[PDB]
Structures are given as C-alpha cells and as structure tokens.
Design a protein around this ligand. Structure first.
Ligand SMILES: [Mg+2]
Ligand SMILES: [Mg+2]
Ligand SMILES: [Mg+2]
Ligand SMILES: [Mg+2]
Ligand SMILES: [Mg+2]
Ligand SMILES: [Mg+2]
Ligand SMILES: [Mg+2]
Ligand SMILES: [Mg+2]
Ligand SMILES: [Mg+2]
Ligand SMILES: [Mg+2]
Ligand SMILES: [Mg+2]
Ligand SMILES: [Mg+2]
Ligand SMILES: [Mg+2]
Ligand SMILES: [Mg+2]
Ligand SMILES: [Mg+2]
Ligand SMILES: [Mg+2]
Ligand SMILES: [Mg+2]
Ligand SMILES: [Mg+2]
Lengths: 126, 175, 49, 52, 60
RNA sequence: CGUGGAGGUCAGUGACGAAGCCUAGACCGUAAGGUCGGGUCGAACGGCCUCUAGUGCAGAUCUUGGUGGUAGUAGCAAAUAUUCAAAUGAGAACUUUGAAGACUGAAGUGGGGAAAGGUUCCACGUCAACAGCAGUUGGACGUGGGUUAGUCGAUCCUAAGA
RNA sequence: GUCGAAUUUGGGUAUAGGGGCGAAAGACUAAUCGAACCAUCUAGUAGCUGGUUCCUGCCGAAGUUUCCCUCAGGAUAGCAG
RNA sequence: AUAUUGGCGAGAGACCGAUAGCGAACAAGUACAGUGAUGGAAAGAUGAAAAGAACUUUGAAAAGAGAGUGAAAAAGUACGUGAAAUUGUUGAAAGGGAAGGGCAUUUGAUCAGACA
C-alpha cells in the first residue's frame, strides 16, 4: 500500500504516463535482468538495456535463443536481436520485437558511464 | 471465402465470385435465376444469344410494368428482357469459374452450375437537386455475385404377438 | 511505393461509396429544411408556386 | 454539468408543420441543423431532473 | 465424417476443428489415465566460419 | 419478477472457454421470468444476505440512426442535326484526324475587359470517385511549368462624405 | 405597356429597428416585416392537446347536498379505505 | 480566520462509458453555413507481432481460384463480437377476391424423459 500523498494509484493516469513517457523515461522502463553469472559477478539485478550487449530469451516462442541486441526501438517499446527473425519464402527477414523484461543479459557492454552506473548501484566489477 | 453454400467433395467443383459490382441487383438476380442449374457451355451459348437478342432473360420477380415479348414463350412467361450489363458480368464470372475448373483438372463437358447467388452490395449514394431547393437520393444498387459449378456424376419392423401369430398362421397355410 | 499505393486505394473506398468528388468534397446536408417543413398555407400569399 | 444539453441555439418550428414541435437547431450547412434539442428524449439533450 | 473420409450449407471452421482436436486429445489423455532461406544462411555461415616476378628494372 | 453500481459471503463460474448473440432441441413457474442442451464467440462473470438509483416502452405528427413496398416505376422529350472512314484502346454513338451535312449570322455560339473567383491557364502522366447514358475524354485525379513595366494601373488630387 | 426622359443603369456615399425609407401598397429594409437578424434573461407563462415503461392477488367508487349574486375558479356533504 | 465554475500544480469518487459523459475520447470550436453578429456537427476497437497474402493461374483491370502468414482470414487496412428491420440461395409447406389468432383433432416432420 502507498503512503505518500504525491503518488497516484489511478489506473488512467498510470496508463497515460506509460504511453506518453518520453525517450529518456522509456530507457529506464526498458530494463532487463542480468543472468545468474552476471548477477554473481557484479552484485546487481537489473540494468537498462542497450545496443551492444548479449541477451538470452527466457520467455515466448523464441525461448533459449541467444544473440546481440540489434536495436533498442523505444518508439514501439521493444528491442531487436540480430539472430531472432521471421523468414519468408521470398528471402525476406523481419525482426522479432522482444520485450527486455522477457530477456536476460549474458554479457554487458562496458564503458566509463556503464561502470559508473554499476558502481553507484553498488557493483563490485573485477 | 465463406460462400452461401458449399459443395461436398470439393475436389469435383469450382467456385467464382465478384463483390461490390456496380450492376443492377434486380436485373442480375433475374439473369442468375435464368442461368441456375444449366450446363456451363449451354449457359454460355444462351448468354451469347441473349446479347445477340435471339433469346431473352425471363423476368419473374422484379417485373412490374415491363413490356411483353414473344421470346418469353420459351420459358412460359410474357415478360422478358435483355440485360446486357448483367449478362456481361455473369459471363465474366462463368469464364473465371471455367478457368478454375480447368486449373483443378475437372472435365469441362460435365460441368453444371450447381449454385448461383446474388446479394445486395452496399448502395452507392449520389444525390440530385430537385424543385423548391430539395435534395433527393440517387442510388446505385450494386451486386455481390457468387457461383459454384460441379461435375455431374452417375428398416426394422416391430410387430405384436398377434401379428406374429397371424403371419405364422399364414405361412403354415401357404407353402 | 506499391504498399503505400495499396493503402491509399483501400482507404479511398468509403468516400468513393459516398460518391465524393475527392478529399475536397465535404458538402454537408442539413437534417431538415425549414422552408420545406414550415408550411401553413392560408388564403393569401404563398411561399412558392 | 449544469450546462449539459443547454449550450444549443434551438427553437420550435410551431404547430402544423408536419413535424414534431420539439425545438430544432437553427443555422445551416451542417448535419446538426434541424435536429431536436433540449428534451430528455432527444439525443444530445438534457437528462430528466439532472443530479445535483 | 472428415476423419472417416451435392450442395450443402454445413461447414466446419478451422478454429472449431482445432478446438475439437485439442478437446479430443484431452479426452484421450483422461481415458488413458483412468526453411530454405534458413538452410542457405546456415550453409553460408558455416562456410565463412619464392612466388612470381614480372617486368624488370626499366620503364616500358 | 427483472436492470446499472456498492458492503459481505459462496477459499462461487471461467482459455478442457467468461460475457454476448443464433437456435425445427429440453424443463420449471398462473405470470413477471428462471434453467439446461447445440452452434457461434473470445475474457471476464454470477447465486444468496443487504445498500443504492439516471432501473423495465408500442405508441408522444416522440429523438438519432438504419431499412422496405412504391419500383427497375415516374422519368433522363426547351435551345432545328447529325453521318462515313481511319487511328488509339480490352472496350468508341460520345476521344483524335480526315471526309460530309448543318448552326451562331458582327445587338454572334466572335474578339476583349469591370465586379467576382483563385490556378480553373499550359504540358506530362492518368480513370477508383464526379461529368443524372457512356467515356480511351475533361474546368476530374497525380506531378510540374507559367504572370518580367520610368511611359498600362495603383500609388498623387479632390467629390458626396468619413 | 413604354421606348429621349418624373428614362434605364455601374460604382462611391448617407439614413438602422418602438428606427430608417416610403409618387402611400401597412410597400421595402439580404427568400425574414401585423414590428429585420443574432445571443442572453430562459428549462419564461398552460384556460388546453399529446404521451407517461414489469407481473399477480385482494378490496373497490363517484353526475343525488348545501354554498361564494351568477360564468369561471373555489368551500362543503355524500359514496370508498 | 472568509470567497474563488479564471490560471498553475496535485490527489480522489457507491459518477458516465462512444445516441452516455463537456459541443469535442479522433488534425473539435475542427469540417461546414452565414455579408455579419454568430451557428456548429459526424467520426474510437485487425492481430501478441504487419508477419497486411510472396509465387502460380484466369481476367484489360478491379478482382477470382489455388497457395501461403497467422492460434484463428467464422481476424484481409470493408477488418473484436456481429442483433433487428430488409434481402438472396437452398429445402419443406399453404394459396378459387387478404393474412394473422383461440379451442380440438387428423396428417407430415422432429424430439425429451422412464428404460428394471
Ligand atoms: Mg409506363
Ligand atoms: Mg435554388
Ligand atoms: Mg448529454
Ligand atoms: Mg460462452
Ligand atoms: Mg429514466
Ligand atoms: Mg420503439
Ligand atoms: Mg402505452
Ligand atoms: Mg414517428
Ligand atoms: Mg419510363
Ligand atoms: Mg433539342
Ligand atoms: Mg436562326
Ligand atoms: Mg443560317
Ligand atoms: Mg455517368
Ligand atoms: Mg485545359
Ligand atoms: Mg490539375
Ligand atoms: Mg458525444
Ligand atoms: Mg467483424
Ligand atoms: Mg433477419
């Protein structure tokens, strides 16, 4: 149960905020959990997804498949993996739209800002 | 898909349809009823003769204040016409059905129109200006046409004890 | 280009059925005309011949 | 709302006009013109005994 | 009748047929208890996964 | 008897199918109605004890929306008038060119403008809708091109007036 | 009918609603004139017309009396619970 | 201390649920009308994902038939469900200037229960 007077439990307001959230908020909304190995290594549970990290599909018809995030399509609330596609007879390949909450991150793309974020969340990398 | 009626054993049948066709619904219904049940080639020749004004389409339902002709005596009617647009649309659908049957590999000489149905498509709503500054409707009544052609292919009785005894007695009396 | 053309042609169908001359034909008819439904004709001057 | 169904400029066409005497929207050039108004039986009108 | 293998208005939809197959599997379980493009891409992925002296010290 | 919402309860019903809808099938009530089967459908819903109301329609020349008979009917009959061949085209009474017959008859069916309209002008492409028949044509649809001033106007002057 | 003037007409300008304008017809004043058009007060006013939504059970009437001068609109007695 | 149908920012309801609720849930004070003051609508729903039907065939073409996508095309940008009025086809039946209804039975069709 909520206790603050500044937070709302209104379903209509919550849905409007979710569907009109800008790109920077959608980055946080599109968070993905780390794997067991990465969780043990870094000491953190979930991170916002980004382009150059490897993921594992743990739900849906494509469960068990692995690959690298081809793109983070924030406009349609999805991420696209290069190895997860749908093929037609005429050679056409269409990316499968995956939600990051249905994935698991197996290898992080590391940079200065990424390490800073991990450390401020409480990470213990290397 | 979803025809008004389908054929059991669909491997010996072919179907054709046309939707939202800008042709008179009443004339098209009369043409389809004049063609219903006929052999395919005979029906096509009849439609060509109708276009040539050698034979006519009998008008049975939508036929109020229609002229009379001698060409209706073949079908035992007095009111018949020659709806060219309806005949052309039905000819197109018949040709498509024959092509479908040929693609399926059916024998073209044994085909007969086993189903044909005309429905009212949504109306095309023009308007006309009339006297005293009025607006009146001016509507086309389009047709949905569908047809299916098909190849032509070639008790325990319980009795009472009295009835059983009577039959036994008759059997004993006879040989 | 062909996909967009098919989309536009499929979208055009309702206005075609309403027999509009185009996207710019947006004539609106009233429900009832008062000059047609305001008639009590006495012995005197009329509104039309 | 206390103004619901009352933000309309409409007047009755009188008796003997071959139509019902409900007030009708004036003006022209739109589908709203000539339609009934203000009545609890009219589409877009005011409800009977509005809640307070 | 289709399992056993004129003009009629009796048709069976694929949705209803699949539901009947699913329900028949449920009933049988209770009774017992009581792509070329993909191949081409895979093949391409698996496939990709002294000497000589001409002329001389002069300008021809 | 029945309807929308509310408190409680049936640890109620439901993707092995909720609600809705259709039904030549079945039952219970004097009745208001209630219940069951089959089909269709695809995500919510009910029994009982109570609370509450924007709670039950055949009518109001009722409102809004939709649809018939009339009916392939009335009609598309003012302005003298059209015809032949070829081309284009899937398709030509209606498009193009040629060959003919006619008309406006200089107070014109000619050549320019004012008000008004605003691209309708012209070229190319092009036919779903519109041109109350048709259409390959169009003032239609799609893409563009085009309006050149010291001397023509405005601009300046004053009129009734403001 | 009239057709060289009390002629026909374009543009500009002036007169605005309990007002204008009128060779006078209560004519005209944007298809509106016995009172222009628009919005608001306003859901204005009813001697009157029309309509007013489920079932069953039981009970079940009233024109017959006195009066406000009499119409109108009211009071009262009676019949039913 | 009091007022607050304007403005800015918040939290809520035994309220309404697309003919309701603001006129407006949508490029709504929009489109459209009027010289002008002003008047003023209609209009939400494929699918989890456009994967929005490649290819063959008939047709001038719109399209049709195969095929295919999809859990489903009894979801084909006319798209959730899909009532009634009204209409087509098929099957059964009645009909000598209306039809419809009530009581009773014949005929045809169809159907439940009780089956120890
Ligand atoms: Mg006649
Ligand atoms: Mg006019
Ligand atoms: Mg309202
Ligand atoms: Mg159900
Ligand atoms: Mg009510
Ligand atoms: Mg009704
Ligand atoms: Mg009644
Ligand atoms: Mg009525
Ligand atoms: Mg006629
Ligand atoms: Mg003439
Ligand atoms: Mg002459
Ligand atoms: Mg002459
Ligand atoms: Mg035409
Ligand atoms: Mg031109
Ligand atoms: Mg143009
Ligand atoms: Mg609304
Ligand atoms: Mg649907
Ligand atoms: Mg029906």
């Amino acid at each position: 149960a909520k206790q603050s007077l500044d937070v709302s439990s209104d379903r209509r307001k919550a849905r409007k905020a979710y569907f009109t959230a800008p790109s920077s908020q959608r980055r946080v909304l599109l968070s993905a959990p780390l794997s067991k190995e990465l969780r043990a290594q870094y000491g953190i549970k979930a991170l916002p997804i980004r382009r150059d990290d490897e993921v594992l599909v743990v739900r849906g018809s494509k469960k068990g498949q692995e690959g690298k995030i081809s793109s983070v399509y924030r406009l349609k609330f999805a991420v696209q993996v290069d190895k997860v596609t749908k093929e037609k007879v005429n050679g056409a390949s269409v990316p499968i739209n995956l939600h990051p909450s249905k994935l698991v991150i197996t290898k992080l793309h590391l940079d200065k800002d990424r390490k800073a974020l991990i450390q401020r969340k409480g990470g213990k990398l290397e | 898909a979803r025809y008004g009626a389908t054929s059991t054993n669909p491997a010996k049948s072919a179907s054709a349809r046309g939707s939202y066709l800008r042709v008179s619904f009443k004339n098209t219904r009369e043409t389809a009823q004049a063609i219903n049940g006929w052999e395919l080639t005979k029906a096509q020749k009849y439609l060509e003769q109708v276009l040539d004004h050698q034979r006519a389409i009998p008008f049975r339902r939508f036929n109020s204040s229609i002229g009379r002709t001698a060409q209706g005596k073949e079908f035992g009617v007095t009111k018949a016409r020659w709806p060219a647009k309806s005949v052309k649309f039905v000819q197109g659908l018949l040709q498509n059905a024959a092509a479908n049957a040929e693609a399926k590999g059916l024998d073209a000489t044994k085909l007969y129109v086993s189903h044909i149905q005309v429905n009212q498509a949504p109306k095309q709503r023009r308007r006309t200006y009339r006297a005293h500054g009025r607006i009146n409707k001016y509507e086309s009544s389009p047709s949905h046409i569908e047809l299916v052609v098909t190849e032509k292919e070639e008790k325990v009785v319980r009795l009472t004890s009295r009835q059983r005894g009577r039959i036994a007695a008759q059997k004993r009396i006879a040989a | 280009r062909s996909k967009a053309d098919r989309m536009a042609k499929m979208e055009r169908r309702e206005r075609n059925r309403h027999a509009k001359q185009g996207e710019s034909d947006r004539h609106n008819a009233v429900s009832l005309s008062k000059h047609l439904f305001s008639g009590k004709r006495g012995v005197g001057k009329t509104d039309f011949r | 709302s206390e103004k619901a169904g009352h933000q309309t400029s409409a007047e009755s066409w009188g008796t003997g006009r071959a139509v019902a005497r409900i007030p009708r929207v004036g003006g022209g050039g739109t589908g709203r013109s000539g339609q009934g108004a203000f009545g609890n039986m009219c589409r877009g009108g005011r409800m009977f005994a509005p809640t307070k | 009748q289709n399992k056993k293998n004129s003009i009629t208005t009796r048709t069976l939809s694929k949705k209803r047929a699949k539901k009947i197959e699913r329900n028949l599997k449920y009933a049988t379980q209770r009774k017992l208890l009581v792509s070329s493009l993909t191949l081409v891409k895979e093949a391409l992925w698996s496939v990709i996964d002294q000497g000589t002296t001409l002329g001389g010290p002069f300008f021809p």
